[PDB]
Structures are given as C-alpha cells and as structure tokens.
Design a protein around this ligand. Sequence first.
Ligand code: CLA
Ligand code: CLA
Ligand SMILES: CC(C)=CCC/C(C)=C/CC/C(C)=C/CC/C(C)=C/CC/C(C)=C/CC/C(C)=C/CC/C(C)=C/CC/C(C)=C/CC/C(C)=C/CC1=CC(=O)C(C)=C(C)C1=O
Ligand SMILES: CC(C)=CCC/C(C)=C/CC/C(C)=C/CC/C(C)=C/CC/C(C)=C/CC/C(C)=C/CC/C(C)=C/CC/C(C)=C/CC/C(C)=C/CC1=CC(=O)C(C)=C(C)C1=O
Ligand SMILES: CCCCCCCCCCCCCCCC(=O)OC[C@H](COP(=O)(O)OC[C@@H](O)CO)OC(=O)CCCCCCCCCCCCCCC
Ligand SMILES: CC1=C(/C=C/C(C)=C/C=C/C(C)=C/C=C/C=C(C)/C=C/C=C(C)/C=C/C2=C(C)CCCC2(C)C)C(C)(C)CCC1
Ligand SMILES: CCCCCCCCCCCCO[C@@H]1O[C@H](CO)[C@@H](O[C@H]2O[C@H](CO)[C@@H](O)[C@H](O)[C@H]2O)[C@H](O)[C@H]1O
Ligand SMILES: CCCCCCCCCCCCO[C@@H]1O[C@H](CO)[C@@H](O[C@H]2O[C@H](CO)[C@@H](O)[C@H](O)[C@H]2O)[C@H](O)[C@H]1O
Ligand SMILES: CCCCCCCCCCCCO[C@@H]1O[C@H](CO)[C@@H](O[C@H]2O[C@H](CO)[C@@H](O)[C@H](O)[C@H]2O)[C@H](O)[C@H]1O
Ligand code: OEX
Ligand SMILES: [Cl-]
Ligand SMILES: [Cl-]
Ligand SMILES: [Fe+2]
Ligand SMILES: [Mg+2]
Lengths: 341, 36, 36, 34, 30, 30, 33, 33, 38, 34, 334, 63, 37, 37, 81
Amino acid sequence: RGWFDILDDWLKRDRFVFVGWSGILLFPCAYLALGGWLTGTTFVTSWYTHGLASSYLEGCNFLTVAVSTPANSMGHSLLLLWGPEAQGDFTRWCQLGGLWTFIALHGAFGLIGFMLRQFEIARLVGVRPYNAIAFSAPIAVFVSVFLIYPLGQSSWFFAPSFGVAAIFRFLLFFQGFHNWTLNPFHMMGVAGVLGGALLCAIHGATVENTLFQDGEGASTFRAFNPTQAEETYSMVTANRFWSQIFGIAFSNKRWLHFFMLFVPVTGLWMSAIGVVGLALNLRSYDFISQEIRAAEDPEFETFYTKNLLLNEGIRAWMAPQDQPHENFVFPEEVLPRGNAL
Amino acid sequence: METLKITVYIVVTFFVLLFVFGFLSGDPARNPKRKD
Amino acid sequence: GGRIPLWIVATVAGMGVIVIVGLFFYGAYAGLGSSL
Amino acid sequence: SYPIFTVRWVAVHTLAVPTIFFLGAIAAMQFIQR
Amino acid sequence: METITYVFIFACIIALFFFAIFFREPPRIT
Amino acid sequence: METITYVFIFACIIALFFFAIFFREPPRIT
Amino acid sequence: MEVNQLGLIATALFVLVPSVFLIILYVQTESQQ
Amino acid sequence: MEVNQLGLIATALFVLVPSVFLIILYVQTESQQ
Amino acid sequence: TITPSLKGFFIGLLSGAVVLGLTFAVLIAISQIDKVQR
Amino acid sequence: DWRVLVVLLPVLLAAGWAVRNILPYAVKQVQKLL
Amino acid sequence: ANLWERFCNWVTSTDNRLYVGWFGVIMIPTLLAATICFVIAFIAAPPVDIDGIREPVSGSLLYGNNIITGAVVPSSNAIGLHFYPIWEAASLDEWLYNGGPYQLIIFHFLLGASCYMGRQWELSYRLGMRPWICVAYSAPLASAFAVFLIYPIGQGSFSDGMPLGISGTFNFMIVFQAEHNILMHPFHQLGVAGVFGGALFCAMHGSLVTSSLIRETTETESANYGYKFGQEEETYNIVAAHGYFGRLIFQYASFNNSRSLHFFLAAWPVVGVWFAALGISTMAFNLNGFNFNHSVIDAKGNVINTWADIINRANLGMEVMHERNAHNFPLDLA
Amino acid sequence: ARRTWLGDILRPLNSEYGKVAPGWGTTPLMAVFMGLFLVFLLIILEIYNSTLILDGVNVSWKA
Amino acid sequence: MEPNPNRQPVELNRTSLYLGLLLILVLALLFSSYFFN
Amino acid sequence: MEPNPNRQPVELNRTSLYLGLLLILVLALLFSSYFFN
Amino acid sequence: TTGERPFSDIITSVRYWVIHSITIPALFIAGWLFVSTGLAYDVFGTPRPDSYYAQEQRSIPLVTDRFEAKQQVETFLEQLK
Ligand code: CLA
Ligand code: CLA
Ligand SMILES: CC(C)=CCC/C(C)=C/CC/C(C)=C/CC/C(C)=C/CC/C(C)=C/CC/C(C)=C/CC/C(C)=C/CC/C(C)=C/CC/C(C)=C/CC1=CC(=O)C(C)=C(C)C1=O
Ligand SMILES: CC(C)=CCC/C(C)=C/CC/C(C)=C/CC/C(C)=C/CC/C(C)=C/CC/C(C)=C/CC/C(C)=C/CC/C(C)=C/CC/C(C)=C/CC1=CC(=O)C(C)=C(C)C1=O
Ligand SMILES: CCCCCCCCCCCCCCCC(=O)OC[C@H](COP(=O)(O)OC[C@@H](O)CO)OC(=O)CCCCCCCCCCCCCCC
Ligand SMILES: CC1=C(/C=C/C(C)=C/C=C/C(C)=C/C=C/C=C(C)/C=C/C=C(C)/C=C/C2=C(C)CCCC2(C)C)C(C)(C)CCC1
Ligand SMILES: CCCCCCCCCCCCO[C@@H]1O[C@H](CO)[C@@H](O[C@H]2O[C@H](CO)[C@@H](O)[C@H](O)[C@H]2O)[C@H](O)[C@H]1O
Ligand SMILES: CCCCCCCCCCCCO[C@@H]1O[C@H](CO)[C@@H](O[C@H]2O[C@H](CO)[C@@H](O)[C@H](O)[C@H]2O)[C@H](O)[C@H]1O
Ligand SMILES: CCCCCCCCCCCCO[C@@H]1O[C@H](CO)[C@@H](O[C@H]2O[C@H](CO)[C@@H](O)[C@H](O)[C@H]2O)[C@H](O)[C@H]1O
Ligand code: OEX
Ligand SMILES: [Cl-]
Ligand SMILES: [Cl-]
Ligand SMILES: [Fe+2]
Ligand SMILES: [Mg+2]
C-alpha cells in the first residue's frame, strides 16, 4: 500500500464515470479530439490549405463544416504547435491545418485509451475481453483511413477532413480515382456492415417476437426481471420459425452471439486492408481482359466500362478545385463530356 | 406468343384463386391457441 | 431538492433547444451562408 | 449529505461550459452579414 | 474456362445450400 | 511452370520416402 | 477473353485446398466414437 | 516451352484429388476408437 | 548548434512533461486525501 | 486588446456569483473530507 | 375431409420442412420463376439496349462479363414504364434485345418477396409467436421496391431501375448521386446511421454477450458447447454485462432489460433502413438532397467554395459522362 | 525425462523458473529507460518527419 | 517411447463444415474475377 | 427414422496411405510430361 | 448508485437554478460577444467576409512552402490592405 496502490485505489473507485489508469490516456485525448473538432468547425477556416470555407463563423452549416486537412505542401508533417511550421503561433497553426493533425493524433491516442478502458473494466468486473477485441475493427478503420492512407499518399491533404460533406467528398474521390467500389476488400466490408445490420435487425426482432408471456401487460418490457435465471424468449420456437421460413436457423445462442461479433468486425478489418492498398494506389481499378476487349471492340460495353467513364468525369471535373496545389488548368475543350450535357 | 399468354394467365389465375380461397378457408382458426 | 417540477424543467429546456435550433435554421436563410 | 464537486461534476462542466459558450457564439453568427 | 469456373462455384454453393438445409445436424432439445 | 511441376512431384516423392521409412506403422510381433 | 493464364489454377486451389482441409477434419470427427 | 495451357491444372488435380481422397480415409481411420 | 526546431523540440518535451507531471501530482494528491475505507 | 476583457467579463461574474452561493456548502464538503 | 380440406391442411401445415402457407403458394412459383430466369440471363443473355439508343450493354458471362461486371440489364428506355412480357414481343430475340428478362425477374421477385413478408407473419401466427418479424423484413423489402419499382415509376422508365448485377449496382449509385445528391439527403444519412449503427450494435451485443458467458466448458473445448439447445437457464450473465457496459460509458446508458435491449436492436437498423428506402423513393420524384452550391458568398460577391461545392464538382463529372450518347438537349430532366 | 549430455550442460540456465525479486524491484530503473527510449523514438521520428531539423542532418537522398 | 500426453483430439462439426465451405466458396466466387483479371 | 443397418466403417491404414500416395505421385510424375506435351 | 447526488434532484432544486440562471446566460453572452466583438476572427485567423480576396484578386492564397508557410500567410494577409 504505497503511493502507487493508493493511486490505483482512487482511479478504480466505483463512481459515475469510471476513470481507471486508462482514463489518464483516454479522457484528455478524447476531449481534445472532440473539442478540437467542435472548435475548428465553429471558428476555423480552410482558406489557406484548401481554398474552402469550413466553419460556422464563415457561413457553413453542420453538413458543410469540417476541420480540413493541411495543405499538400505540408507533406506528412506532424504540424506540432511548437513545430517549425507554426513556430508557436496558434493563429498560424489553425490556418495551416494544425488542428487536423491535432484531432487525428489525439483521436488516435484517445481510441487507444478507449480499448485500454474496455480491457481495464472487463478485468475488474471479471468478464472476458471480447468488447475490446471487437473494438479493434473501428481502430483498424481509423488507423488505415486517417493515418496509413495519407502516409502512403503525398501528404495529409488526401486524408479525410473531419466533416460531413468533407467525408462525402472522400467517398467520391475514392470512386473517381481508386474505383473503390470495385475492390473486393471494400465489398467484404460492405457485406460485414450490411450483414451486421441484418443480424442486428433479425436478432432483435426474433427475440421480441418469441418472448415468453411472463406478465399480464400488453407492453411486454415489464415482464423481464434483470435477475431472472430463465431465458426471456423461446430459442426452440425461434429455431423452428427460421428453419421453416429460411431453411437454416441458429440452435446455439453462444454461437449466434459470437457470429454477431464476427460479421461486422471481420468486415471492417477487410475494408481496412483494401484502404492500405489504396495508400499505395494499389487499386482494384481495372479488369485487364475487359480493357483489351473494349479497346479492340468498340461495340463491347459493360456496366464496368460505363463506370470508368463516370470515373474519368469525376477526375477531370473535380481535380482543379479538389487539388488546388497542383494548379490544374483544364481548358473547357479538354473536359470529357457526353453529348448535350 | 398468344398460346404463352393464355398459359401464363391460366397459371396466374390458378395460383391467385388458391391464395384467395385458401385465406377464405377459415384462416383465423388455424393457430395453436384459439382454434375457434 | 424538488422545488421546480421536472416536467417544467424539461419543457423549458426542450423549448429553448427548439428556439436555438430554430434560430440556426433562420440563419440558413439570412446573412452568411444564405447564398444571397 | 451528498458532495457537490465530484469527478462527475468536472466531467459535466468540461462539456457543458464550452457548449453553452459555443451556442452563444453560433447564435451571434446568425446575424452577421457579408 | 472463366464462365465454367464461375458457374461451377455457383453450382457448388447451391449444392451446399441443399445439404445445409436438408442434411443439417438436427437441432435436438435436451 | 513445367520444371517447377516435375521438381515438386519429385520432392513430394522424396518426402514420402522419408515418412514411409521413418514414420511407418511399426511391425509388431504378436 | 484474354484472362490471366494462372487464374484457373489459382481459383481451383483456392477452393480445393481449404475445402478438403475442412472435409478431412469433419470426416475424422464423425468417425470418432 | 510452348506447353499445353491446361497441363498444369491437369497435373495439379491429378495429384491433389486422389491424394486428398487417401488423406481423408486415412485420418478418419486414425480417429476411430 | 541549437536550431530553432531543436528549441521547439525541447519546448514540446518540457510542455509534455509539465502536463504529465502536474496531472500525476494532482492525481496522487487527491488519491492520498480521499483514500478507500478498508 | 480590450475584447478579451469583454468576453471574459460574464464568465468571471458568473463564477464569482456561483461560488458565492456555494461557498457555505463547498466548505462543509471540504471539511468532512479533510 | 374432402380434398380441399386435405389440401388446406397440407398448405398451412406446421410439419412441413419449409413452411408453405397461402403466401407461399404465391411466393414459391414467383421466386422460382425469378431465380431461374435470373441464372439463365446472368449466364447467357445477349446484350440489351438499356438506354433505348441502339447501344446494347453486355450483361452475361458468356458475352464477356465476369461475376463483378455481369448483370441482368434493365429494360430499354424506349419501353419506359410499359409492361413488356414475352408475349408482347414479336420473338424471343426481340424480347432479349429490349431487356425483357429484367422486367420478368423484378416483377416476379417483388411479388415473391412481398409474399415472403406475408409468409413470415403466417408462420408466426401458426407457431403462436408474436407477429412482427415481418415488420423488420419490411425494411429491406421497401428498399428493394425503392430501387426496382418506385424509382422507375418516378423517373418514367424501368431503364432507370437498379440493374441485377454488382457493377450495375455501382452504376446505379454513381448516377443517382449525380442527379440527386443522395449523400446530402438526410434520409440517406439516417440510412447510413442505421447500417453503421446496426453493425456497431451487432458487434456490441455480440461482444457483450460473449464477454459474459457463464463458464461451462474446459479450455480444450469450444465455449459454444456450454449452451444446450432448448435449455431453460440463460447462457450469459446479463447483470455482469450491464455491470461492464454501465461502467464503460455510465450506468444509465446501459440496458438492464433484455427485452428493451433486443427491441432497440430491432428498432435502430429497421427505422434507419426504412428512412433509406424513403430516401430513394422520394428522390424518385426528384426531391433531392441539400444543395449548398454557391451558398457562401464574400462581401463583394465572390463565391467562397465549401466542401459542398467540391461534391458538386464530382457530381458534374458523373453527370456529364453518364449515358454519354443519350442526351440531345441541355437538361437531364428524368 | 531424458537426460542428455547437452541437456545437463544447459541445466542451470533453466533452473530458476518462477524466481522473482521482491516487490517493485528494478521497476523505477526500467521506467527511466522506457522514458529515454520514448524520447529517442520521438527524436528519430521527428528527424525523419522534418519536424526536428538539425545542422548537418539533411534528410534527403542528397547526403 | 511413451506417448505424448499433450495430444488432443480435433473436431469440426457439420455446421462448421457447412459454414467453412460457404466461406471458401463465396470467397472464391468473389476473388475469381480478380484472379482471372 | 431408424438407422440403416447395412452401414460399415471404412479404413485405410498408413501403409495403404503410403502405397496410394506413391502410386498417385509416380503416375503424376509419369503422365505430367504428356499433360504438358 | 455510486454516491453522487441524482441529476433529477439537482436540476429541480432552487439552489441549482439560482446559480445557473446567471452562469448559463453569462456563458451564452460571453460566446455571443466573442463573435460580435470580432475576437474569434483574430484568435483563429478566419477571414472576415471582406478579407478572403484582395479587390481584384481571383486567386486563392494557397500555402505552397512547408517551412515558409507562416511567412506566406502573413504575406497573403499583407496583400489584403
Ligand atoms: C494523456 C494525455 C495526452 C497525450 C498522450 C497527448 C499527446 C499529444 N499531444 Mg496533447 N495535450 C494534452 C494531453 C495529451 N496530449 C493536454 C491535457 C493539453 C492541454 C494543455 C494538450 C495540448 C496539446 C497541444 C497544443 C498540442 C498537443 C500535441 C500532442 C502530440 C505531440 C506531443 C509531444 O510531442 O510532446 C512530447 C513530450 C513528451 C513525449 C513527454 C516526454 C516524457 C518523458 C518520458 C520524460 C522526459 C521529459 C524531460 C525530462 C523534459 C526535459 C526537457 C529538457 C531536456 C529541455 C501528442 C499526440 C501537439 C499536436 O497535437 O500536434 C498537432 C500539439 O500541438 N497537445
Ligand atoms: C452499400 C453501401 C455501402 C456500405 C454499407 C459501405 C461500408 C463501408 N464503407 Mg464504403 N463506400 C460506398 C458504399 C458503402 N460502403 C460507396 C458507393 C463508396 C464510393 C466508392 C464508398 C466509399 C468509401 C470510402 C472512401 C471508405 C468507405 C469505408 C467503408 C467502411 C466504413 C466502416 C466505418 O463505419 O467507418 C467509420 C469510422 C470508424 C469506425 C473509425 C472509428 C470511429 C470512432 C470510434 C468514432 C468515435 C466518435 C466519438 C466518440 C465522438 C463523435 C462525436 C460526433 C458529434 C461526431 C464500411 C465497410 C471506409 C473504409 O473502407 O475504411 C477502412 C472508407 O474509407 N467507403
Ligand atoms: C453464375 C452465377 C449465376 C453467379 C451468381 C451471380 C452473383 C452476382 C453472385 C453474387 C456473388 C456474391 C455473393 C458476392 C458477395 C461476396 C462477398 C462480398 C463476400 C463477403 C465475404 C466475407 C468473408 C465478408 C466478411 C464479412 C462477413 C463475414 C460477412 C458475413 C455476412 C453474413 C453472411 C451475414 C449473415 C446473414 C444471414 C442472412 C443470416 C441469417 C441468420 C439467421 C438464420 C438468423 C435467424 C435467427 C435469429 C435469432 O435471433 C434466433 C434467436 C434464431 C434462433 C435464429 O435462427
Ligand atoms: C492529462 C489530464 C488532464 C488527465 C486527466 C484525466 C482525468 C483523470 C479526468 C477525469 C475527469 C473526467 C472524466 C473528465 C471528462 C473529460 C471528458 C468530458 C471527456 C470527453 C469524452 C467524450 C468524447 C465522451 C465520450 C462519448 C461517448 C462514448 C458517449 C456516447 C455514449 C453512448 C454511445 C450511449 C448510447 C448507448 C446506446 C444506447 C447504445 C447501446 C449499445 C448496445 C446496443 C449495446 C448492447 C448491449 C447493451 C447492454 O447494456 C447489455 C447489458 C447488453 C448485453 C448488450 O448487448
Ligand atoms: C434507465 C434504463 C434505460 C435503458 C438505457 C439504455 C438507453 C440509454 C440511452 C443513452 C443515455 C441517455 C440518457 C439517459 C436518461 C436517463 O435514464 O436518465 C437517468 C440518469 C440518472 O438520473 P438521476 O441522476 O436522477 O438518478 C440517479 C439515481 O441514483 C436515482 O437516485 O440520468 C443521467 O444519467 C443523466 C445523464 C447526464 C450525463 C452526464 C454525463 C457526463 C459525461 C460522461 C461521459 C463520460 C463517459 C464516457 C466514457 C468514455
Ligand atoms: C483545440 C484546442 C484546445 C482545446 C479546446 C477544446 C477542448 C474545446 C472544447 C469545445 C467544446 C466542447 C465545444 C462544444 C460545442 C458544442 C456545441 C456546438 C453544441 C451544439 C449542439 C447542438 C446544436 C445540438 C443539436 C442537437 C443534436 C446534436 C442531437 C439532438 C437534436 C439537437 C437539435 C438538440 C486547446 C485549447 C486545449 C489547445 C489548442 C487547441
Ligand atoms: C376471388 C374469387 C372468389 C371471391 C369470393 C367472394 C365470396 C366469398 C365466399 C365464397 C365462399 C367462402 O366460404 C368459405 O368456403 C370455404 C371453402 O370450403 C369453407 O370451408 C372451409 O371450412 C373450414 C373453415 O373453417 C376449413 O377448415 C376447410 O378447409 C374449408 O373447407 C369456409 O368455411 C367458408 O367460409
Ligand atoms: C476431392 C476428393 C474429395 C473426396 C471426398 C472423400 C469422401 C470420403 C467419405 C468418407 C466418409 C466416411 O464416413 C464416415 O465413416 C466413418 C467410419 O468410416 C463413420 O464412423 C462410424 O464408425 C466409426 C468406427 O466404427 C465409429 O467410431 C463412429 O462413431 C461411427 O459414426 C462416420 O459416421 C462416417 O461419416
Ligand atoms: C491440401 C490440404 C490438406 C491438409 C491436410 C490436413 C491435415 C489434417 C490433419 C488432421 C489430423 C488429425 O489427427 C488425428 O486426430 C485424431 C483426433 O482428431 C486422433 O485420434 C485420437 O482421438 C480419437 C478421439 O478421441 C480416438 O478415437 C482415436 O483412437 C485417437 O487416436 C488421431 O490419432 C490423429 O491421427
Ligand atoms: O436513363 Mn438511366 O440516367 Ca435517369 O437522368 Mn435522364 O435518364 Mn438517363 O439521363 Mn440521367
Ligand atoms: Cl453511365
Ligand atoms: Cl435528351
Ligand atoms: Fe441477444
Ligand atoms: Mg446565415
């Protein structure tokens, strides 16, 4: 019972918001990430890094505000406030996009603090640490998208800017430049997300519709008691319903709930790997056999060749303003267009 | 083409008739509790 | 302890939220960001 | 009988104090003209 | 060979559906 | 690929010799 | 179509290798007492 | 050398298909009581 | 020599140590004052 | 810059007013903990 | 018992391995028709003049496509919303050129999938269950109606419905963003919060239950063997799971009622996907996402770009390139 | 178990399983080295990053 | 030589066979287009 | 339904595994040149 | 149940609202003045509606040099007068 054990006593007190040792990392890093985002979206411009207004103070709404990435000439600079770019000037640091790296780094260490908190509480309450393990998927996504992706690219400029429309641009950029929908790792991510949402909806509806009558109310929530040993719904009835509707059904509740962990976690991990490839421009952009055939046969058309024409439109129309460090002047006659439009 | 049209119409009518007459065949009573 | 009833608190707090968000939607049509 | 300043008090005020400051700032922004 | 491959895998999936539904390990109440 | 194939099969045969000699089912007097 | 010359064997082994791994493990499970 | 384009998969399946058939049968024999 | 970014490094190192040192001194002090009842 | 006084003027006059109403009860919480 | 009573007893029989039922007597032939025509058309259909401009798009595997690029192509723009069964065509060759299979597949599928919803009510009625699983399935079913039927009706053509293929799906998405700015529509954003939230809550509920499983097994066995099918005791400790999750966030953010928990698991993805379906279905009548193009203006009048203007630049590139031979006049009005 | 010539030589090197030093031991020394290692990693990170620029250290292929 | 006591029997139930074969075949259905390119 | 009584366990001893794998691999070593041609 | 006072008890008490009917409007008015006095532009460097461009400038003042970026912004700001 030295000073360490006395400090360990206080950090793990049963209070309203648990602290723990992880709370030393989680709480300041998460609050600065959140507070940095709310600060930038309320007050900070993107005029010098992107040529964009991006705060409420400039006139943007909630959908259009962002803490935008630094200028492409920053490279992968950490953009520390005391670093050689800002040199301690907070105002210049904000104008250089120093808030973006502030949010991304405090957010990264905050996420590390959150998984440590999951591990710490699970160890203290005596449960298995599967919630910490499932949280590795959001960590893999944040690390691949906001860190590994721009680190493979020219600068932090091409990471997502922390904002709603800014994120939508990032989606459209990945379509037009990376053809990211064609990527099988993204497709595995889509199956994990939509499968997990299916599993969320299907499991919740099945439980709620195979409930045992454990009370007289027509509003059935009161008939559950948190200390009951018994199942509140009929696994046998649920199993027979789905076996006859759909052909298969869960018969093991433990496997069912593991599969609910597995599906969206595996999906997000799969999507992270595809983005790691896109950090190097290792895209699933084309199918070579279709390109050889289309180049020699001008009647050969698929939805895939149609999507590449859309991709070429996206690149030529968006690049001069989306990449204003390149100083793209595309004269109007060079622009790919269809007839009339 | 006319012969296909008459076949498909006959087939569709047959299955719609089974659905309608089937749900008219005392459907509320076909349940495990109140078989009234 | 319990001097102002909580339904009064919730109603006034819920109305001030409406007023402030309502001002935000008003500001979408006036001044900066309104396109005029 | 209960205390007044806890960790929960700090956690509440680190969010609520800047939030009310920001809402006042954003309300003022609705009256700026170009 | 490509078309054969894609149809083959598809046919194996559909066969797997048949065995997974009609030759499943029967859920047993115990 | 041809040379790889022929060497692969050869190496699998030589591996099989190893298991057939040193990991044989032991002949037991009974 | 001018497809990858190794694509057929890459697909065939991608199926057959882990499929037979599961078949081995399943059948030896059923033969247990 | 300009070899048969199907020769590699023909060889790979000629090995792997009856080899795994024997591996399945052997391993389920060992797992018997 | 000590370049400006080397001075910036020492400022960033010291500022971090101050933030770590003040926090741990506050957390230790509160822990010693409000102990557990065993 | 005169404006840093103006922005902090209601923040100051709120804290000192809140700590005026809470000082008879903030001392009693400090006393039983001490 | 006459033959009709014997037949009705079989149709609604709870002892059939797959439940037939009265919705099933419609679901079974329509889905079989839609499936069979889909597999055939995906493998072997000739190219389809989807845009009505004598420019046929190859959808099938035999005509060049792979699994990703293949599609059953939507019917010709010259057809519009006209009903095009096989017997309307002068030949099967004409039916295939004009995208006949697409109309056959989607009409049979939407009829069958509607009956799949009714079949879900029907069996729950026969099994004595509560009836609202079919309400949860109404969320994906409405989405299917949105992309295959409601969006063609508003735009005036089945040529604008979602193609039955992976790359054709992506083509539908990109063109939809170009014309409707769906990302800036709050019903799609609510839809995203539904599926992201659904995936989060799936992983959350899965991990929390797995984290609190009661020890019934040794180290050398799967923990799933600790649960027996039809056992009466619950297989995890919900009080321990609430004790964890109520300390991860705070106590009142965590469910201690499993019925309230599982209703929230049903309600969050379903309502969000309902809103996503109403996103597509109301963008069908061209009430589009939020337009903030040139919303921020300086003191002189210079447009100050935002991220919304950058989205618009991407949307313009999709707009000018899509169906690059199909437009003769300067507005894309449908 | 099988005694071997090499096994008997290596025996003292696998004899003190579970042997610990009392209490905190050399933990405060270890934390000092971890702190120095963390600072070392930050130095080499910021040199490579161009955040820390030193005289005579041109972080480029030109060298 | 005496048997190794650390040995354990291995299992894979039928549902796990069906799940794995579903996973392998669907992954092959997904990736085969990219393997052919 | 009652089990089928005609069912019998199947065996393949290790020597039969080695013999069969020898036969398959040598047949492949022989025929592969002709498969490649 | 962790010892702190319940939130329903606090926000319904008169002493909470005696304190907070001053503190809550004071923080709101302080935020209002942070914008209305113009301090938010000076602290954050955000352009006012008349200071995005010079009067005949059509070009965006994009930062193009990493280590002279602080000087480029300052130069861009001196170009506005
Ligand atoms: C757990 C809390 C925590 C963590 C992990 C971080 C982490 C970070 N902060 Mg944040 N920060 C925090 C709390 C935290 N912060 C708090 C509470 C505030 C408000 C005061 C801030 C305000 C802040 C600002 C304004 C900035 C950061 C920045 C950073 C990043 C760089 C920091 C650095 O390089 O210093 C290095 C210091 C250390 C690694 C400490 C070393 C300790 C060793 C082991 C002991 C040796 C020290 C030695 C004795 C010192 C002697 C000096 C002498 C030699 C001259 C890093 C991600 C920067 C950033 O976000 O970039 C964009 C930045 O600009 N922080
Ligand atoms: C069918 C539609 C569909 C679906 C279901 C998905 C699904 C996905 N997309 Mg894809 N996308 C699609 C279509 C779709 N996409 C299309 C058509 C395109 C255009 C090509 C894209 C372009 C695209 C891009 C560019 C990216 C994705 C990514 C993803 C993955 C995101 C996972 C995630 O939740 O990150 C959300 C973020 C996290 C999980 C990180 C951690 C977040 C922390 C934990 C949040 C903390 C919040 C904090 C407490 C406070 C918040 C305060 C609040 C007020 C803001 C997921 C697999 C991403 C990806 O692949 O990542 C690897 C990605 O970068 N998509
Ligand atoms: C030649 C021809 C015709 C070609 C075919 C054409 C064509 C286009 C083919 C499609 C190709 C295709 C399928 C590609 C998609 C491939 C794809 C993207 C792969 C994803 C692979 C991958 C590993 C992804 C990682 C993420 C992941 C693991 C996802 C899995 C998602 C998944 C399967 C979710 C489960 C969905 C599902 C329907 C489950 C229902 C479960 C069910 C029975 C619940 C019922 C139930 C609920 C209860 O609550 C209780 C209590 C009980 C008891 C109960 O029972
Ligand atoms: C260096 C320095 C200064 C250090 C000092 C650090 C220090 C010690 C400080 C302590 C003081 C303190 C705490 C400071 C505060 C700082 C501060 C305010 C930090 C900001 C942190 C921040 C960003 C906030 C966190 C945001 C957050 C996580 C909130 C979201 C909450 C949340 C999602 C709530 C809704 C929950 C919801 C209903 C989802 C349900 C999910 C779900 C379906 C689960 C399934 C499920 C649920 C169950 O329930 C049970 C049962 C089971 C079975 C089950 O399936
Ligand atoms: C009650 C069960 C209902 C099921 C709950 C599941 C859905 C819950 C919805 C989400 C929460 C909604 C609000 C609850 C609504 C509700 O049920 O209220 C009840 C709850 C407690 O009420 P009282 O405090 O009156 O009751 C205390 C009891 O002891 C009564 O004596 O209120 C709150 O917790 C207020 C929330 C303020 C939040 C302060 C947070 C401080 C910051 C903490 C953030 C840090 C943690 C982050 C870790 C990284
Ligand atoms: C960055 C930085 C920092 C920090 C700061 C911070 C931390 C801040 C915070 C801040 C904050 C913390 C703020 C707040 C804000 C708030 C707000 C802005 C709010 C709003 C709200 C609203 C608007 C609401 C709405 C809604 C929702 C959401 C849902 C439901 C419905 C309703 C409508 C109600 C420092 C200095 C350290 C350093 C340098 C840098
Ligand atoms: C769309 C074309 C038809 C339009 C129909 C509009 C008029 C509807 C009245 C037609 C007759 C319906 O009348 C219905 O017929 C069936 C068929 O035998 C009767 O007979 C039924 O008896 C019981 C009902 O409990 C069932 O178990 C049994 O299988 C069935 O034979 C129903 O008891 C009677 O209610
Ligand atoms: C690419 C090529 C792939 C080819 C695939 C090869 C398929 C080979 C199928 C072999 C199947 C053997 O089938 C399996 O036989 C064993 C015994 O042999 C049976 O096992 C049965 O007998 C054994 C021994 O008496 C008992 O221990 C066991 O409890 C009992 O079930 C299994 O119940 C049956 O499932
Ligand atoms: C192309 C891919 C090919 C991949 C090849 C896959 C190799 C897989 C090897 C699996 C080997 C399993 O190995 C086999 O395990 C079983 C149980 O599992 C053991 O079986 C043992 O336990 C069982 C069950 O308790 C007893 O009935 C049996 O008498 C005993 O020997 C066998 O003695 C061992 O030989
Ligand atoms: O078809 Mn299919 O996409 Ca509906 O917009 Mn008009 O048209 Mn065409 O153009 Mn844009
Ligand atoms: Cl197109
Ligand atoms: Cl036109
Ligand atoms: Fe559950
Ligand atoms: Mg305005």
